[PDB]
């Protein structure tokens, strides 16, 4: 939200589900934020760098979060587009 | 669903996307027309010519070898009948049930099925009368019906 002077007027901007493009509400206690370690390419070891995803509670309780986290990890380089 | 029954089955033909004649087919357009003209002399209706040609010769769809549907091919030589295929078979079915009911007046199922055939004759004749295939004065009658198929 902006006004005609171009300044912003929301209290905060809420996050959206990485699998589904829908807003995660302030009381969605079934939702999660996932965090995953990157590894260096010469020795397969943690360098302290990481990647993150957020998942809606409605997609978790129907059983679709495992396949959603897998598609996200194949779209990024982690699973390397072969299986 | 079916027009006079509770059934809703799905069986029908499914034509391929490719309209072309196949390279192995030895027949040609005017020899297919002569085979159609010979089979018509035996009194075969258009629906019977297409199965004899599909089963015993190479032609899967006559309309793809010869550019015309086979009732047109017979009409252009005057070989086609006056009363059309389906209306002939419906009228032939109604006279068989009427020969049953003259001696079996207790058969109340046969009485009910005759209403469902003759109301299907009336619906199909009303269609053909608007497209000029039949005279405007054409009428099915329960006394006359035996004379329509002689």
């Amino acid at each position: 939200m902006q006004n005609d002077a171009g300044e912003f007027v929301d209290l905060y901007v809420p996050r959206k589900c990485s699998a589904s493009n829908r807003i995660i509400g302030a009381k969605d206690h079934a939702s999660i934020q996932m965090n995953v370690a990157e590894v260096d390419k010469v020795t397969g070891r943690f360098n302290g760098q990481f990647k993150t995803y957020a998942i809606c509670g409605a997609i978790r309780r129907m059983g679709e979060s495992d396949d959603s986290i897998l598609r996200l990890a194949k779209a990024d380089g982690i699973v390397s587009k072969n299986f | 669903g079916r027009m006079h029954a509770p059934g809703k089955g799905l069986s029908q033909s499914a034509l391929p996307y490719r309209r072309s004649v196949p390279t192995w087919l030895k027949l040609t357009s005017d020899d297919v027309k002569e085979q159609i003209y010979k089979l018509a002399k035996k009194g075969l209706t258009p629906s019977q010519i297409g199965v004899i040609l599909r089963d015993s010769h190479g032609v899967a769809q006559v309309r793809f070898v010869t550019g015309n549907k086979i009732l047109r091919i017979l009409k252009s030589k005057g070989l086609a009948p006056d009363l059309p295929e389906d209306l002939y078979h419906l009228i032939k079915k109604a006279v068989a049930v009427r020969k049953h009911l003259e001696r079996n007046r207790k058969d109340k199922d046969a009485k009910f099925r005759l209403i469902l055939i003759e109301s299907r004759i009336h619906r199909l004749a009303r269609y053909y009368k608007t497209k000029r295939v039949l005279p405007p004065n054409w009428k099915y009658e329960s006394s006359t019906a035996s004379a329509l198929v002689a």
Partner: protein
């Protein structure tokens, strides 16, 4: 079906399994074949779901019999499909 399977590229084993009218584009399961018999050897063409009791050019009394599904051959030398 998962949440994300693409509809434009069914595998041939997904397409061959389903009904002829419910495929992405329609196609028949029936075919044409060439058939040959003992005693007289002029080859002839037959449709696999025939309704006619076929007689060959070799004048044998039955080449095949009709049935509620595919027609059955009288132990003829070929059941070979034509390619197209």
């Amino acid at each position: 079906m998962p949440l994300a399977k693409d509809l434009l590229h069914p595998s041939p084993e997904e397409e061959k399994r389903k009904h002829k009218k419910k495929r992405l584009v329609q196609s028949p399961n029936s075919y044409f074949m060439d058939v040959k018999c003992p005693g007289c050897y002029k080859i002839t063409t037959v449709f696999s779901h025939a309704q006619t009791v076929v007689l060959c050019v070799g004048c044998s009394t039955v080449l095949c019999q009709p049935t509620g599904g595919k027609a059955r051959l009288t132990e003829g030398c070929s059941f070979r499909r034509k390619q197209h």
